[PDB]
Amino acid sequence: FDPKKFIDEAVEEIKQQISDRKAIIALSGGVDSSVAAVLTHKAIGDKLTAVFVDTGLMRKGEREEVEKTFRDKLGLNLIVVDAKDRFLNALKGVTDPEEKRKIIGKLFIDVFEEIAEDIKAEVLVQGTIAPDWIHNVALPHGMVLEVVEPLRELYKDEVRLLAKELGLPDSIVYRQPFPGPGLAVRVLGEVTEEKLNICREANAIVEEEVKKANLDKDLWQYFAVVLDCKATGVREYNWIVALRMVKSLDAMTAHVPEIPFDLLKRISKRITSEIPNVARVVFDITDKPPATIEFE
Amino acid sequence: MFDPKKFIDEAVEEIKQQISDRKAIIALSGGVDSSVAAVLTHKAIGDKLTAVFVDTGLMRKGEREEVEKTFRDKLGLNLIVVDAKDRFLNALKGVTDPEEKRKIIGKLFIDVFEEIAEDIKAEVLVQGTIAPDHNVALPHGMVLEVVEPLRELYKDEVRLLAKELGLPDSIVYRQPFPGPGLAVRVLGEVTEEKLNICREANAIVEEEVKKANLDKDLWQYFAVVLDCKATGVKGDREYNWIVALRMVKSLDAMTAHVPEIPFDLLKRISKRITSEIPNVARVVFDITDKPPATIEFE
Ligand SMILES: O=c1[nH]c(=O)c2[nH+]cn([C@@H]3O[C@H](COP(=O)(O)O)[C@@H](O)[C@H]3O)c2[nH]1
Numbered sequence: 001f002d003p004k005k006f007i008d009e010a011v012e013e014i015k016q017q018i019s020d021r022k023a024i025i026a027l028s029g030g031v032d033s034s035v036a037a038v039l040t041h042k043a044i045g046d047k048l049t050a051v052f053v054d055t056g057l058m059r060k061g062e063r064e065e066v067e068k069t070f071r072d073k074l075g076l077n078l079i080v081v082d083a084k085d086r087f088l089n090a091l092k093g094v095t096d097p098e099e100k101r102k103i104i105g106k107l108f109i110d111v112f113e114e115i116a117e118d119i120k121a122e123v124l125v126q127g128t129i130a131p132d133w134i135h136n137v138a139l140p141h142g143m144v145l146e147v148v149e150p151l152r153e154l155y156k157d158e159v160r161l162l163a164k165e166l167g168l169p170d171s172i173v174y175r176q177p178f179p180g181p182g183l184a185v186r187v188l189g190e191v192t193e194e195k196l197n198i199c200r201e202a203n204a205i206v207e208e209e210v211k212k213a214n215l216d217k218d219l220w221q222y223f224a225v226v227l228d229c230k231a232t233g234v235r236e237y238n239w240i241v242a243l244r245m246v247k248s249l250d251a252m253t254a255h256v257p258e259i260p261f262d263l264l265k266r267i268s269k270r271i272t273s274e275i276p277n278v279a280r281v282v283f284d285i286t287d288k289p290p291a292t293i294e295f296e
Numbered sequence: 297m298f299d300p301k302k303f304i305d306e307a308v309e310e311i312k313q314q315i316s317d318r319k320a321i322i323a324l325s326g327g328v329d330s331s332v333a334a335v336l337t338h339k340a341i342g343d344k345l346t347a348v349f350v351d352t353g354l355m356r357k358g359e360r361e362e363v364e365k366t367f368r369d370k371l372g373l374n375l376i377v378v379d380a381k382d383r384f385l386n387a388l389k390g391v392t393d394p395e396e397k398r399k400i401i402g403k404l405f406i407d408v409f410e411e412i413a414e415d416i417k418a419e420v421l422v423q424g425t426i427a428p429d430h431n432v433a434l435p436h437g438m439v440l441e442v443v444e445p446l447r448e449l450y451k452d453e454v455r456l457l458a459k460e461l462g463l464p465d466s467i468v469y470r471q472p473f474p475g476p477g478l479a480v481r482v483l484g485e486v487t488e489e490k491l492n493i494c495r496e497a498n499a500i501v502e503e504e505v506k507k508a509n510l511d512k513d514l515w516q517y518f519a520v521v522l523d524c525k526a527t528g529v530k531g532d533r534e535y536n537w538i539v540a541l542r543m544v545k546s547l548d549a550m551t552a553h554v555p556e557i558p559f560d561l562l563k564r565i566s567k568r569i570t571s572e573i574p575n576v577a578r579v580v581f582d583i584t585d586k587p588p589a590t591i592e593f594e
């Protein structure tokens with residue numbers, strides 16, 4: 001794979017497919033979407049509008065990171081929607097994982113379609129990677145956009161090589177995949193502000209320590225989950241946090257590798273010392289199969 | 297340097313004299329302390345000792361059968377076994393408070409034991425009280441004279457006394473086990489389904505830890521059924537129970553820590569649990585030292 005070649009080629013292919021129309025892209029902060037947004041911006045400048053929807057379920061500091069990288073550094077038109085209270089209010093009382101997924105997917109695409117209308121987008125750019133067993137698209141309230149997918153034939157490692165070349169920050173280039181529903185499926189039972197806070201801070205500790213250990217390039221994913229069961233501490237009851245770390249090619253199968261004991265111990269103690277209301281930290285030692293990667 | 301052989305002749309002589317012709321009773325927990333006091337006492341007064349094993353259904357897999365073979369068959373003690381499984385399970389229906397679990401189990405055990413105490417007109421309560429590292433009144437009002445042959449020994453001495461008395465290694469070196477048993481290793485309600493998971497999980501843990509020769513280097517190694525659920529793939533996302541593995545070293549009552557366990561052993565225990573015990577979605581390993589955690593999960 002020649003990243004220099006591919007960029008030149010792909011910038012040219014997009015400009016001609018998109019021609020002079022207005023395009024839109026959802027920035028997750030992940031690598032695939034970040035790479036496609038930057039390729040597209042190179043191809044069409046201010047015709048591109050990027051949208052960041054702050055669902056309140058994102059990793060700590062995402063909004064700022066996306067602003068500083070895409071708006072400040074790179075100069076993309078960037079629309080940011082602070083939708084935290086809206087997504088939290090909607091999840092009040094919801095414990096069914098599938099109801100969480102449906103609610104969050106719906107609010108998300110509704111806000112996205114709203115912005116796409118406001119700006120009269122005609123093209124949707126997505127960072128979809130290969131393969132394609134998984135072209136216009138109709139959005140749920142009827143708006144139709146032509147789809148461009150410049151990474152549609154690329155794999156994980158090719159795209160990491162691309163983001164390097166395009167000068168994206170290291171935090172993006174090696175960003176682990178993160179779900180649409182974000183932290184809401186890493187907080188079992190009800191997504192309260194209390195449990196969401198614990199979740200967000202535990203995940204920041206996991207990310208920081210895994211980065212210090214240079215395991216961010218080897219691991220597929222590495223995260224913390226707030227379980228909806230409690231255990232005892234020094235005798236008071238509080239939240240159990242589970243750590244989840246796996247290797248995988250694509251998320252189809254997964255194995256828990258040998259994680260240095262020191263690293264796990266250090267995470268554990270940072271979590272119980274720095275985050276009030278956590279009694280216990282445990283580590284998931286279940287492969288996929290028979291487990292799924294996420295806990296719900 | 298403590299002398300087991302001498303202690304046995306001095307103790308057996310002292311037990312005979314404190315007890316006399318009278319009927320004595322003891323609770324067998326399956327632990328080393330009560331096991332030793334029972335055997336000493338049985339050398340002193342033979343058939344005047346009644347040993348009681350209450351099968352609460354909350355003990356480790358195979359416990360009743362090991363007590364039978366060891367104390368009735370091998371040593372010839374008068375053993376009564378009360379099958380109280382249904383009784384303890386029925387009493388814990390709906391009970392999710394850990395304090396209340398502990399209370400219910402404590403008092404119900406006393407009620408079964410006291411019933412036997414009355415039945416057989418016992419006068420003396422032998423206990424396995426040892427040193428830190430006498431009448432009692434039962435609930436209905438029966439009074440027992442307490443005899444504590446081991447009150448002065450430390451755990452290390454008791455263990456030496458137990459080898460000399462012919463007890464198996466399975467008793468002598470067994471990790472300590474809570475009075476309320478598997479009840480405090482099933483979080484939330486103790487249902488029959490969760491308990492059965494807890495029992496087999498613990499048997500898998502004990503077996504694998506022994507096979508890897510780590511029983512020596514660990515204080516406690518057990519499984520807990522958490523009252524929360526995670527996803528598992530079977531065909532097209534099932535919800536099932538999370539089991540947690542707890543392995544600690546500890547040198548005093550204030551502290552414990554999680555040592556480095558070989559990862560192959562962890563993965564082995566994990567893969568056995570999920571493949572062999574229906575309705576477990578995930579196995580997690582506790583990486584919290586004491587402080588800030590406790591050893592048990594509740
Ligand atoms: O965008 C997403 N929305 C979701 O609802 C969702 N659920 C799981 N995942 C991710 O997919 C992979 C497979 O996850 P599981 O083994 O938990 O099914 C893992 O990499 C998970 O993070 C999701 N991504």
Ligand SMILES: O=c1[nH]c(=O)c2[nH+]cn([C@@H]3O[C@H](COP(=O)(O)O)[C@@H](O)[C@H]3O)c2[nH]1
Pocket residue numbers: 398472473474475476480516586589590591592593594
């Ligand atoms: O006989 C008992 N009845 C109980 O209710 C009980 N709770 C905890 N333990 C045992 O005591 C030690 C310290 O327990 P924690 O660190 O969990 O507080 C550990 O070795 C525990 O196994 C119990 N033993």
